[PDB]
Structure formats: structure tokens, C-alpha cells
Design a protein around this nucleic acid. Structure first.
Length: 577
DNA sequence: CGATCACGTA
DNA sequence: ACGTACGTGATCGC
């Protein structure tokens, strides 16, 4: 049972509690809190939020760092409270992050899923309580109050067994010193948001709209017929049946029209270059103009992403609503989108700092490959050096094509090398790709030993680990299906690299936040994009940031090779180049 | 409403 | 025979 409380009392304010601050909307920015539950040594309490959040003693308790709270997804609560002007402190255990670290593959998205990992089932999945999609709703108070108290009771019961397993895994510091402090930093970044120049975005959409109309009219006259260019089915009929273009790859239902396939078809018809261009413009228009404008806040003109900290299988963050980790940059036309991302205050600038080749530097460290470590100790161009070694030429004899192919080898090595995967990427035969791979391992025998050993270790232990002891279980490493087993082998090779790189930048973020506070800088973190950090700061702080930010990022961990950070700043995200 | 294509990023 | 890890939008089916 539990107390359905009319007022906040002293016994609800104990120095250790499980706390539920329920935000049902999936995007929690400026979202309602629908109910609160507190479980502690004195009992179990449900509080209505309009009462609790107006009570100065409850607000003081929330913000008291010495009053310890155990929660699930405390960032969601912390951010929803920030929009109400209320500080949440003292979160000493986050069951979402604890479950994520123990096993990211569970996809633990609610308390019930985490509870099931320890044979605790006296709590309902959130989706069973609130419903799915269209029929999603907050239930009546008796039903809501029981759910929130059951969630708090589950958190109360599950802290000890989760912490015990984290300790056995040597992941306790990973939770308490990395992921939990990072959660507070992400909460601040999301709450700050990024300012958008919506007038510039709208002007870009207008120009894109004209150019789409121009290319689309060109495609129709080249096909002698109007059709929905955005339908892969209609497009496949036009290309491979009407225009009789060669079919070099079929999908499941019909024909493949992916950009790769289209590159090869461009010699046969002028329509193919136009379809590629039409796809480029339509992607910018639908996803990065129209889509961005849909989630810009009309009052502040800011976007407030949500960084999912407990989703990826490697320890990376992801970013949603909007995804600010896939804003175009590779092609100049899309890169101009970044001109619409601007500082949030006048006389401020965008500052962007990125690790140089962090994945291959991590590989050099974990493989202890003499040649690879020496290449980074010389700060060589790694792809040119790889071409020199693979193709047995001096630096002067590396042609652009040779560097391009060596780069592709380097990407395959990080991803989990295979002759078929490299052959697909370089448009060469499997036998040729195998020759490249054999030459690579002759030049980097420590990497070869590492890759063999990590696959065997994944088989023996059942999992692989990162530098800071994140883990990923790989049960498919023992499969007798070649495809399934090969997937797991590539994951064994890639996850310690991608995951260790994630560990490093997460530590850098914690270290940076602490240095910014010590220095009393106004500069603030806005975004992380896997190997880069984006900040905004007064123009008068740029000189100090040019020294501080790369140093903090470079010193976040000590590896057998240096870490190298490049940086740029300017009046928009585009200009921070 | 739900997988599939496709394409954007590191 | 599949490159590693993500998210969004569109089409198309029931």
C-alpha cells in the first residue's frame, strides 16, 4: 500500500529515497509532470505535482545534493524540472544507466524491463499503462498513482542488486564517475538548446524549392513521362523497364535504386545524374529545412535535442527530435544548412573542437602495433602512410587513387575487415580485396594479432570491453551460421574501438565542464557529435578556449600515442571550419 | 500505424 | 557473403 498525500510532510524528505517524477510525453522539453512518487524508509508516497512543486520544503529537498535520490532516467526529470525553474540534485543511482551498462542489448527503456533482469515483475511496462501512439494517455489518478509507486518501489528494491553486479563487472566507477555525471551535463546542453536562424532556413527552402522544380521537370522530359521520383518502385520501372538501363542489383520486391547503384548507371542516361541531384535536394528540403523548422521553438527559435544516453550498443550517444548529429557537411550545398545554426546571444561565437583520427589512435593503443603507433607518434597522414605500406611506395609515389583505397582499407579495419565488405566498398573483386587485406596485416602485424585475439576473447568470455570497461555481449560469435557469426566477429573487432572512443570523449566532456566552471567562463557546451564538441561563447573567450578545449580533450585519457584535437570558430556553425 | 529504402552523420 | 554505429522521411501495404 501507499499514502496518497494531500500535502508534503517531513517524513517524505528523508536523506535517501527512490524518486519518480513522471513525464509521460516522449519529448520532455517544457513538458508536464503528471505525478510524483517517493519511497523511503518511512513509507511510500504519491504526491500531486501541483502541490509538491509549489511546496518550498519539497523543492529544497529536490535541490539538496546531500539528500540522495535513486531514479530511472533522471535526465528526463532533471530537464522537465529545469523548464519549471527547479534544480534536481543528489541523484546517486540511475537505474536506466545501470541497466544500460550491465547489458545494452536488453533495450531497457522502462523500469519494468530493468526489473525483469533481476526477477522482479511487480511493476507494469509504461506502454501497458499509457498505451501506444494514438491511444496514448495519462490514466486516472488511482491507476497512475499505483504505477508510479510501483516504479519507485522497484527502483528502491533494485539498486543493491544492480550495484552489486556493476561492482562484479568492475563497472561501478563507470556508472558513478562517468555516466551519471555525464547525464547532468547532457541535461544542461539539451536545456540550453541551439539557436536557429529560421529566416535563413526559410530562404534556403525557397531556393531549394525552385531547384527541385527545375530538376524534376528535367527528369520528366528525360523520361518522357511524369512519375513520383521519390518512389523507389516507380523510379525502378522508369529506369530498368522503360529506359532499359542495366540491372546490376535487385532488391527484395523489385530493383535497387540506391545512390551507389545510380553512380554506375550515370554513363547510360542523362536522367541518372538528375535523379541523384533531385535526391540530394529533396533530402535537404524534407529533412533539414522542413523537418528542422517543425521542431524549432517558435518563441526562442531554439532547437532542444534529446541525447539518448542509453541506446547504442557501443556506448555512443544518439540525438533525436532533431538529430543534431547528422547535419550535412560533406557536400557544399548541404553544408550551407549549418549557416542557420548560430550563437544564442549577440557577440557570441560557435567553437568546434574535434579529435583527429581517434578510432585509429585507439586501435594503435589497444593493438600495440609498433608501425601504427610510430605513424601517430610522427603525426603522419595515416591514409598516406597506409598506402605507402600496403602498396610499397615512397610518399612521393602515393597517387590520389592509392590514398583513397588505403583509406577504405583503414575504414574496413575499424569496422571489422572482410574481403567481401572491402570488395563491395571499393567496387573490386574479393580476391583483389583479400590481397589488400593481406598486405595491410603484413605492414601492421600487431593489428592482425589484436583482431585474431579479440575474436577469440569474445568467444571465451562471451563479451568484449572498452577502455573504461563498457561491455557488449556477443552470443552470436559461436553461431554455425556464417552470416550470423561473421556479424558478431565484426562487432568484436569494432566495438572496443568505437566504444573506447566514446568513453574518451565522454570523459573529456566531464573534464571540460569542470574546467569551464573553475575558470568562470560563460562558454557552454551545446552538442557532441561522436568525436567532436561544439560550444558557444562570448567572442572575448575565444582565445582562452583555443588553449583550454583541445588540452582538456587531449588529456582526457593517456594512451600509448598522443591524442590530437583540431578546432575552429566562427559566427555560425558553418563558419566553425 | 509499420518494415523497407534511402540518405544524412561519425 | 555484410562493411561499424545511429535518426528521419517517404512510400506503400493492411
Amino acid at each position: 500500500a501507499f499514502t496518497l498525500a494531500d500535502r508534503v510532510t517531513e517524513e517524505m524528505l528523508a536523506d535517501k529515497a527512490a524518486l519518480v517524477v513522471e513525464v509521460v510525453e516522449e519529448n520532455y522539453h517544457d513538458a508536464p509532470i503528471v505525478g510524483i512518487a517517493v519511497v523511503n524508509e518511512h513509507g511510500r508516497f504519491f504526491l500531486r505535482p501541483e502541490t509538491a512543486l509549489a511546496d518550498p520544503q519539497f523543492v529544497a529537498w529536490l535541490g539538496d545534493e546531500t539528500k540522495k535520490k535513486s531514479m530511472f532516467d533522471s535526465k528526463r526529470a532533471a530537464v522537465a524540472l529545469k523548464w519549471k525553474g527547479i534544480e534536481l540534485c543528489g541523484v546517486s543511482f540511475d537505474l536506466l544507466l545501470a541497466a544500460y551498462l550491465l547489458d545494452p542489448a536488453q533495450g531497457v527503456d522502462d523500469v519494468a524491463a530493468a526489473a525483469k533482469m533481476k526477477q522482479y515483475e511487480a511493476v507494469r511496462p509504461d506502454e501497458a499503462v499509457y498505451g501506444k501512439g494514438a491511444k496514448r494517455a495519462v490514466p486516472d489518478e488511482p491507476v497512475l498513482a499505483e504505477h508510479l509507486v510501483r516504479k519507485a518501489a522497484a527502483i528502491w528494491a533494485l539498486e543493491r542488486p544492480f550495484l552489486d553486479e556493476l561492482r562484479r563487472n568492475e563497472q561501478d566507477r563507470l556508472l558513478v564517475e562517468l555516466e551519471q555525471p555525464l547525464s547532468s551535463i547532457l541535461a544542461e546542453m539539451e536545456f540550453a538548446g541551439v539557436k536557429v536562424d529560421t529566416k535563413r532556413l526559410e530562404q534556403m527552402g525557397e531556393e531549394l524549392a525552385e531547384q527541385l522544380r527545375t530538376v524534376e521537370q528535367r527528369i520528366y522530359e528525360l523520361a518522357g513521362q511524369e512519375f513520383n521520383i521519390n518512389s523507389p518502385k516507380q523510379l525502378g520501372v522508369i529506369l530498368f523497364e522503360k529506359l532499359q538501363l542495366p540491372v546490376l542489383k535487385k532488391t527484395k520486391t523489385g530493383y535497387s535504386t540506391s545512390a551507389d547503384v545510380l553512380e554506375k548507371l550515370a554513363p547510360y542516361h542523362e536522367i541518372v545524374e538528375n535523379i541523384l541531384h533531385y535526391r540530394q535536394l529533396g533530402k535537404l528540403q524534407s529533412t533539414y529545412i522542413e523537418g528542422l523548422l517543425k521542431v524549432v521553438r517558435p518563441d526562442t527559435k531554439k532547437v532542444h535535442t534529446i541525447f539518448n544516453q542509453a541506446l547504442t550498443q557501443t556506448g555512443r550517444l544518439s540525438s533525436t527530435e532533431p538529430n543534431l548529429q547528422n547535419i550535412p557537411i560533406r557536400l557544399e550545398e548541404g553544408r550551407k544548412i549549418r549557416q542557420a545554426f548560430v550563437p544564442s546571444e549577440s557577440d557570441w561565437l560557435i567553437f568546434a573542437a574535434d579529435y583527429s583520427q581517434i578510432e585509429l589512435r585507439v586501435l594503435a593503443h589497444i593493438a600495440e602495433d609498433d608501425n601504427l603507433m610510430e605513424a601517430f607518434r610522427r603525426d603522419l597522414d595515416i591514409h598516406t602512410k597506409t598506402a605507402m605500406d600496403i602498396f610499397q611506395v615512397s610518399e612521393d609515389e602515393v597517387t590520389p587513387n592509392m590514398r583513397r583505397q588505403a583509406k577504405a582499407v583503414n575504414f574496413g579495419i575499424v569496422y571489422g575487415i572482410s574481403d567481401y565488405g572491402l570488395a563491395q566498398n571499393l567496387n573490386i573483386s574479393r580476391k583483389e580485396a583479400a590481397e589488400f587485406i593481406e598486405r595491410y596485416f603484413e605492414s601492421f602485424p600487431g593489428v592482425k594479432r589484436y583482431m585474431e585475439n579479440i575474436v577469440q576473447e569474445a568467444k571465451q568470455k562471451g563479451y568484449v570491453t572498452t577502455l573504461l570497461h563498457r561491455r557488449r555481449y556477443l552470443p552470436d560469435i559461436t553461431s554455425r551460421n556464417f552470416n550470423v557469426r561473421s556479424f558478431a566477429e565484426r562487432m568484436a573487432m569494432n566495438t572496443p574501438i568505437q566504444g573506447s572512443a566514446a568513453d574518451i570523449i565522454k570523459k573529456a566532456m566531464i573534464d571540460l565542464n569542470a574546467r569551464l566552471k573553475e575558470e568562470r567562463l560563460q562558454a557552454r557546451l551545446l552538442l557532441q557529435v561522436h568525436d567532436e564538441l561544439i560550444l558557444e561563447a562570448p567572442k572575448e573567450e575565444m582565445e582562452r578556449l583555443c588553449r583550454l578545449v583541445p588540452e582538456v580533450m587531449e588529456q582526457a585519457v593517456t594512451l600509448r600515442v598522443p591524442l590530437k584535437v583540431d578546432y575552429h570558430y566562427g559566427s555560425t556553425w558553418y563558419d566553425a571550419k
